[PDB]
Write a protein that binds this ligand. Structure first.
Ligand SMILES: *[C@H]1O[C@H](CO[C@@H]2O[C@@H](C)[C@@H](O)[C@@H](O)[C@@H]2O)[C@@H](O[C@@H]2O[C@H](CO)[C@@H](O[C@@H]3O[C@H](CO[C@H]4O[C@H](CO)[C@@H](O)[C@H](O)[C@@H]4O[C@@H]4O[C@H](CO)[C@@H](O)[C@H](O)[C@H]4NC(C)=O)[C@@H](O)[C@H](O[C@H]4O[C@H](CO)[C@@H](O)[C@H](O)[C@@H]4O[C@@H]4O[C@H](CO)[C@@H](O)[C@H](O)[C@H]4NC(C)=O)[C@@H]3O)[C@H](O)[C@H]2NC(C)=O)[C@H](O)[C@H]1NC(C)=O
Ligand SMILES: *[C@@H]1O[C@H](CO[C@@H]2O[C@@H](C)[C@@H](O)[C@@H](O)[C@@H]2O)[C@@H](O)[C@H](O)[C@H]1NC(C)=O
Lengths: 208, 208
């Protein structure tokens, strides 16, 4: 019958003080004469009832896409609790159990390095500011760019990539009008990861 | 029933002269009561019988895995031709016609900028050499690193990322012993893409 998917909390949610991290159990392609879907939430094999499965949603598929959401404690996500989602139905000869948890493995402090635009790139109106983040484990992480306290718009970050030593790296590309980098403006690559002091580091990036 | 997955050729196989590009039809979850699988490859509608359904392979989870492979003209792919794989199983209520082609749109030339390690990283044993390749379209691309005619081993490349303007970028990180970067060796990032002159370009990178 149906098919189930289970989502981790966002990295920023598990690593920053007053946020609301939450793993999300999502059901697709249910029945119709059997819309009664039960969820059962277990933390490390212990059932918690502190959930809230927001109402069924009639889709144009003629399926009810139901969604449950467990607000989890950020220290729980980090200390590596397994969140198991049991989903019951009539279309199920047996329920569905999907389990999720932070990657297990020894965490690794990311190295953060800011790279200025290529000398070749100066013949362009816009320049590329680069942020290199390597040797982190596990892959969960967040990178933002700002200048003078205020955030920056025009950046994109590659996904984490498994490096040769079993750690991850990524790059973040920030784009600015050459004029801005020229004036001597300062920009900042911010990074959030668990193996960081206060879960937070940052690196400025300026011309000479 | 069974599912199907169609795959494009490898970028370098459609970009470099004497290579042999192939699209590949992979059928999975095949049974045993009606396990005869027939393929009827069509190219841009007008059928092709230059195909090959290389022999039947088993699988772990008691399921099955049947893979055909059409060798294809490289320039044909670049022109934009549609490649149709047509499967015929009996556990099917109907044959499948999954389609694949190159990304439509105006091919754009990649920009290639090499980037020396951050001064901060010179206090490490190994250093990171960085190749920023941006503004290309479509995403199909190949990147390689080398020095003195020999290739380099220790490198990794992020997947193409969609940029704010509809173009792709990526980075490639080459990792070497610091000592080799102090000698002032020359290192090169090579990029193969359909929009370049001879589908090829390369960028030096060396110590100041
Ligand atoms: C029993 O086992 C087998 C074996 O699989 C595994 O084996 C064991 C050992 C364990 O690892 C198990 O986890 C697992 O069972 C099962 O066979 C599997 O079948 C599933 C689906 O039923 C497949 O998932 C899909 O994978 C394809 C991509 O496949 C390539 O890449 C894989 C990794 O990404 C790689 O493992 C494969 O071998 C394969 O390799 C590529 O093949 C070409 C040609 O050979 C090669 O040249 C490439 O280099 C190579 N690439 C590599 C190596 O990475 C993926 O496309 C599927 O995702 C699409 O479809 C989904 C719908 O199911 C959808 O959810 C996704 O979002 C995505 O949708 C597509 O999105 C694109 C945009 O990107 C869009 O254009 C399309 O329209 C859209 N397609 C749709 C929706 O139609 C999906 O991830 C497994 O690959 C396959 N395993 C292998 C290894 O063959 C078997 O089914 C199992 N039985 C059971 C229990 O069901
Ligand atoms: C059926 O549709 C379900 C809900 O998707 C939503 O409604 C469809 C019609 C679109 O409007 C879509 O953009 C919405 O998100 C899906 O969750 C479900 O997977 C679909 N079933 C399948 C597998 O086709």
């Amino acid at each position: 019958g149906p098919s189930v998917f289970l989502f981790p909390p966002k990295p920023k949610d598990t690593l920053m003080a007053s946020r609301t991290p939450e793993v999300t159990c999502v059901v697709v392609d249910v029945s119709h004469e059997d819309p009664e879907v039960k969820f059962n939430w277990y933390v490390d094999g212990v059932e918690v009832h502190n959930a809230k499965t927001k109402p069924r949603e009639e889709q144009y598929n003629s399926t009810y896409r139901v969604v449950s959401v467990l607000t989890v404690l950020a220290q729980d996500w980090l200390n590596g609790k397994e969140y198991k989602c049991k989903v019951s139905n009539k279309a199920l000869p047996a329920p569905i159990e999907k389990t999720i948890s932070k990657a297990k493995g020894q965490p690794r402090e990311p190295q953060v390095y800011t790279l200025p635009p290529s000398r070749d790139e100066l013949t362009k109106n816009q320049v590329s500011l680069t942020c290199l983040v390597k040797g982190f484990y596990p892959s969960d992480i967040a990178v933002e760019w700002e200048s003078n306290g205020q955030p920056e718009n025009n950046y994109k970050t590659t996904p984490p990539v498994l490096d040769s030593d079993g750690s991850f790296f990524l790059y973040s590309k920030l784009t600015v009008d050459k004029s801005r980098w020229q004036q001597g403006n300062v920009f900042s690559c911010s990074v959030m990861h668990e193996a960081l002091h206060n879960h937070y580091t940052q690196k400025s990036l300026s011309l000479s």
